[PDB]
Symmetry: D2
Subunit: 208 residues, 4 copies
């Protein structure tokens, strides 16, 4: 059997039947991840403009739009073993520009920001409670990086009881390889990989 | 700059300074994932044998050895959106042979089994509590599959405050591509990828 | 100011605006907690019959009905510090009668049982995912004991994003004092304390 | 039999065998809970002074000292059902004086502050990860209020795998009844209730 045949027989890759209460999660489009002056950053310019379109529509339709950022207090750095492996993350300190949401996302004062300490937007955060509290059934995940925080957020979203959509053109990464690998795993096991055009049309449809 | 230089500059790929309270986590070496009569399974013959060596030594040294398995009640199936995407997992039912831990692992009567409903062994489970309760500082993660439950468990282990070691020869997957992509991401961001020979020598060293 | 005036000015004791997607959580009505032959048990006979009425109605109306039980593998006992304080709980072993749901609840084969290791039905369990996955917005909490597992479950339910109702006549405890104290705290801070008559009428109303 | 005999027979009230890696958790000694100009506050003058002694010693011994606070973005308010019941908490806004830690605690610039959205300091927060990451085995819990955030934090600490000590003279509440009821439940089921004198002597003993 080919890999495609193996995954098919294993029952992977089924489509998600989308719900009627969407929410947008924008994962770590902070300057630390989007401004190339910083060692941890990637080129996310196109991805942020696509994400802005999605968020602008969702916000106007009164669907939840939630941004995430990784930020640390100095005393937390030696306490968290993730920062031993991923030591570049220690630069993401409260009060620094690195932790601020990139303005290219079109973030507005109303928009809730959730601060987290790991990869997943759900881990050690209030995110699940906000989604459950707004009766969310379907999440659209965007952000940086595809192979890191985005993939981790996607796994947690489906595990938490939410259907997951991922517009590939809204996900940025440091390299094509890990980007493609995570989108494959997501499409097979965790959510539907699609594009912003689909998302936009879909959001208009559920509002209608 | 090259991918290697980008990840280096971003602060990834640092070694783990190993602790002195090890625990072994054996992720989903149930018959459902190891016996090729089931379409969800992979060839894990070598991997289980190497995992057995690690577990036997750890158990003899009184380090926690914890096995995980995915099992569902019929009523849970329509409740969990993961099962929409990965519908093959719905075969993993309480009372079935699919959910039983494969005896090739060497599992003993008093070894703890954690039942979970998703990919990560930590998600919606008692795992973090067992490890914190035993003052564990370093986990060795093994099992099936590398790109699925293993990877998810590794991300959660480091996020939960445990240093992570992953012996690659103890991890099985249904395809080479996803296996290697996950090992890459782990080595960069989440833990140290190594082999069973290293783990065995290391466990004896902490015992000494 | 009187205590009543203090709590009122502090903004406590507001009513809950009930949602339209109810679920019933039956906390630890296992024989270990309901059969007086066991040291950990209380008289829960009246409470179980009221709970049975609620569950029978909810089940027939196709609202989720979920039972919880505390059960341990022998190897878990030394790992969990809760069992150092509450050592009677160590008797609740898998395969024992103590962990079985009391038949007086009217539990049916279809009903999902969630196994947990602590007080809260949400802690280290799949409960939140089942409720989110069924688009639940309002939970009715019943079980044993009011001051222990019930109160803990109630706190976690509201924290998790669900509105909470507690029929007092469905909650059993070892003594009146702790029972009354927890119902007070719940009414002030966490949910609406009411009775089974109210719940039954309310469930019929949302179905209608 | 009497209540005392019932709790004894049920296996409650056992002493905690204290560990050797202490951490201090200071629960919500923010101005919102300690400054009587705010209707959510209680007199915590003595309690903060005794907590300061514990924190000063722990900090000098390089044991983690972690402060918690409840803070909301305006957008989060309609999302969290806890705020429907306990509407006074909606005053606890980012940027306000209400959410700042009271300087009477002795809090130092590099002491870690964890922001949370509910009662328990562990719920939807990074707290468990910080404690596991520092190999903490025993927590001392202090703060406001005994029957609310303190109690919830204590339940979660033991559930999360940490032994719990609660110096009663470091816990403040807005009424005597709930304070005593919570201390009773804790002493029976979750941790050891003691005083600051004991904690100070104990901390020096583990240091020796």
């Amino acid at each position: 059997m080919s890999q495609k045949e193996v995954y098919d027989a294993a029952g992977f890759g089924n489509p998600v039947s989308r719900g009627v209460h969407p929410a947008i999660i924008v994962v770590d489009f902070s300057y630390g991840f989007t401004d190339l002056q910083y060692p941890t950053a990637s080129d996310a310019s196109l991805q942020m403009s696509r994400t802005k379109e999605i968020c602008d529509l969702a916000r106007a339709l009164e669907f939840p739009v939630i941004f995430t950022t990784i930020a640390y207090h100095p005393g937390e750095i030696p306490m968290l073993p993730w920062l031993e492996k991923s030591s570049g993350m220690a630069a993401l300190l409260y009060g620094s520009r690195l932790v601020e949401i990139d303005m290219a996302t079109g973030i507005q004062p109303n928009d809730v920001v959730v601060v987290k300490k790991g990869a997943s937007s759900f881990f050690g955060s209030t995110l699940s409670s906000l989604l459950a509290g707004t009766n969310t059934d379907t999440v659209v995940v965007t952000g940086a990086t595809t192979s890191g925080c985005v993939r981790a957020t996607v796994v947690d979203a489906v595990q938490s009881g939410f259907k997951v959509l991922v517009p590939a053109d809204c996900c940025a990464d440091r390299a094509k390889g890990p980007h493609e690998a995570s989108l494959y795993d997501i499409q097979q096991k965790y959510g539907d990989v699609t594009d912003s055009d689909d998302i936009l049309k879909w959001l208009r449809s559920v509002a209608g």
